[model samples]
Target: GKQIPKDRGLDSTLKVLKEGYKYVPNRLEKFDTNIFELRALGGRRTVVFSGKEAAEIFYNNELIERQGTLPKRVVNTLFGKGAIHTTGGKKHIDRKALFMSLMTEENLEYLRELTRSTWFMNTERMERMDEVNVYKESIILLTKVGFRWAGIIASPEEIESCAKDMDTMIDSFKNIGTAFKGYREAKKARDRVETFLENQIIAVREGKLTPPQGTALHEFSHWEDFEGNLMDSRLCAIDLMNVVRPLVAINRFVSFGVKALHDYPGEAEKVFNNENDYAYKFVQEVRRFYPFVPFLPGKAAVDIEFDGYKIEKDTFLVLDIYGTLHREGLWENPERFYPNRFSDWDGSPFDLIPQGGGDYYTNHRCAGEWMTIIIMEESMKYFARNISYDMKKDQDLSVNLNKLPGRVVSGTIIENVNALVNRNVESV
Candidate 1:
């Protein structure tokens, strides 16, 4: 039997906090194996897995459960209490069904159209500003689309405030903080979302605010639980932000997409040629090469074994999302930022999991995964075709991966912007 290698430490939680995304990969390299063990979260025994096959097993609901795995702070900030992220079996299916219902082909197309319109409309204003932060602008655009697409009514300031708060929450989730001030903002954002959606849900019930028939706000508010009762208003509100928060998080991928564009001009040119096929390929590559989610944590449902090793019941398990994408032998030239590699991808769920892996509708794979790609494809195409700008000199383009969601130093700045109406207008 291959022994599961264990780390010698009181706990690796602080180490993980220090190493950020590199924690698992570093240990995997030293151990020379796909799996290993460490104590995290103040002495909880944890087995960490990386690679395609491991992801397949890690996401299996029968093998592991999400409930009680996430920290209280994380649940409050990211995955709200009573979120689908915490459910299993029939409960998960029911909640997941409500989300899946809103992701019909028609709704996704609507979201695509909404994202495109938002980006272009925002681009018009970017043409006027001498200097602009691409990432900041993207958050604003995605936030607006989030509110409008979800059928929520809000003033511009209110929507922008939501966007800013969500961005703070997303940016702050990685590191440990004191007084929970940084973490407090996520709770704050969650509360604001709860209250806002509660009002919206109330209005929907009272026939005051009529969301479109199939929109997220309407569907979530009206979704029934196992006992045929409506979801608690607060939990429903959390679920509602479940739709928008991730949409705002898409800003990170978009930031990385912009970085990919600047860093890989050749690939950028391919997208500029109106090569819709290559455009999608490029987006996929950006998602692969850059880090978004570091990993996923769950717990064993019962005793399990793999690679001649035993995993006791209730043992905490972490799937290395970033490492799996970058794992040796899984991807050829894993470190390179080549967009064309996806052209011949085998379509394996486990291989390229930026958002997550496995069946989107069934497993815990992100429901908004499609929407992320839809928005990114639009951003890539828009950046390649609709806009032209020079990468500002002396700008630090290196990504700080130490951060939970890594970002470029200068936010990938561009100067002397040209929103050419068409290709006929040459560079200014």
Candidate 2:
């Protein structure tokens, strides 16, 4: 078993995933009372709670762990403590700057057409196919975007195959670890991606680069966090791709987006007509509601107390973003799908981040937080208003959360001849 961080007074929130362990009861069934994950996987332990109090402190910047441990970060290369998710302090802040530079209106605008095209392509690829796997579809879409941004051609079949193999390992964790599968696919993708980046970085290497106005490749190509020195191409390529994949992993993201348009027709209407990338905020709300990045785990460098229990050194603290966001009182109509729930919602904007808010989303204190939201919004418009399909059943169009949760609304989707033709023929 991998050595994960542990904490007191909480059972594994994700215990539905069995290991060589006795099954524990669900934490949500008993509210306010804390249940610690004592003695899991030999040394790894966890402490968990499900309520507003949990949300307030859990998501705060002070407690977040960028890296679970030195060893894990170093061992797992694609996603490690080196990335913002597992990292903290000046390093995270600085590395985050690289990401911020990539989110400018101009840079992001370049991607809208890309996002639209991917949505159309993936939607078409799945047409006539019933019982869709929206999750897997999401991975393909994001992987394709990753390559597009890096300036290379990507194989949808290979990317999709890679993503499925990896996600299957992660979700099942039964006989295999995603680490192994992910590494294999990522290693292959890395070669093609590096060749692309090397060509893209030629300008920066030749000193034709300027500060604060180019792509993430340009910015990160200049980053250095080693003991005391500048970063090199190999590390930069790996680091850059690290940023690339996760940003594109907005695959789990579509589920929440689809849930929103399905549940709230009004919001969907607003986006279908807007050509501007102005519907980003509505996307943020969907992220808040159905957060794809749910359990951000941290290991205590030193013992700390939360939920009135001592999180002993090296103990795991699993922050349940999903349970917290869906809390009945924290967010209005907690169980219901509602984007307006966050319209006037006040809290730490960036800290309420599903992504590193300020660095990525248009700098509203939360980076790139808005970009993915916009991507989803634009995608929804492409389907809901701009593109129409008939429901396959009486309550015909149902979203299947079963296999990454997407469904065929109608028996088969043949594009709107008039609407699609107009979009395809746009001369801009």
Specify the highest-TM-score model's number: 1
Task: Compose the digit string of candidate 2's lDDT tens values, residues 1-428.
Answer: 22222334343323433321112213443333434455333334455544545544444545444364333522343442234544466666665666666777877777777887777766555555554444455666766675566443336675665454334323322211223334554444445555455554655667764434355665676656645554566556556655555555566566446545655767766666553433555666666665344444555556566655665666556555455555556666766765455556665533355542322322212354546666677666665654444322333444332221122333222222223434456577
| Candidate 2 residue 70 C-alpha distance from true site, Å | 8.6
- Which parts of model 2 have CA positions greater than 4 angstroms off? 1-14, 18-25, 34-36, 50-66, 70-88, 113-146, 150-213, 224-229, 259-267, 273-282, 301-307, 310-314, 350-353, 356-367, 391-428
Q: How would you encode candidate 1's per-residue C-alpha lDDT over 1-428 as one tens digit per residue?
A: 67899887987778877787788899899998888999877677889988988888887878878777777677777777888888878888888888888888899999999988887787768888887778888888888898899999889988888888788767655753222556766778777767877888988877898888888888887888879999888888888888988898877777778888887658777987756488888888888888778888888888888777788888888888989889779888899987778878889988888888888767888988888888889987888778888878877888876656577767777777787565376677
RMSD of each: 2.3, 7.3
Q: What is the lDDT of residue 67 in candidate 2?
A: 61
Candidate 1 overall lDDT versus native = 0.81
Per-prediction TM-score to the true structure, in the order listed: 0.95, 0.67
Q: lDDT (CA) for every model shown?
A: 0.81, 0.50
Model 1 segments more than 4 A misplaced: 176-181, 423-428
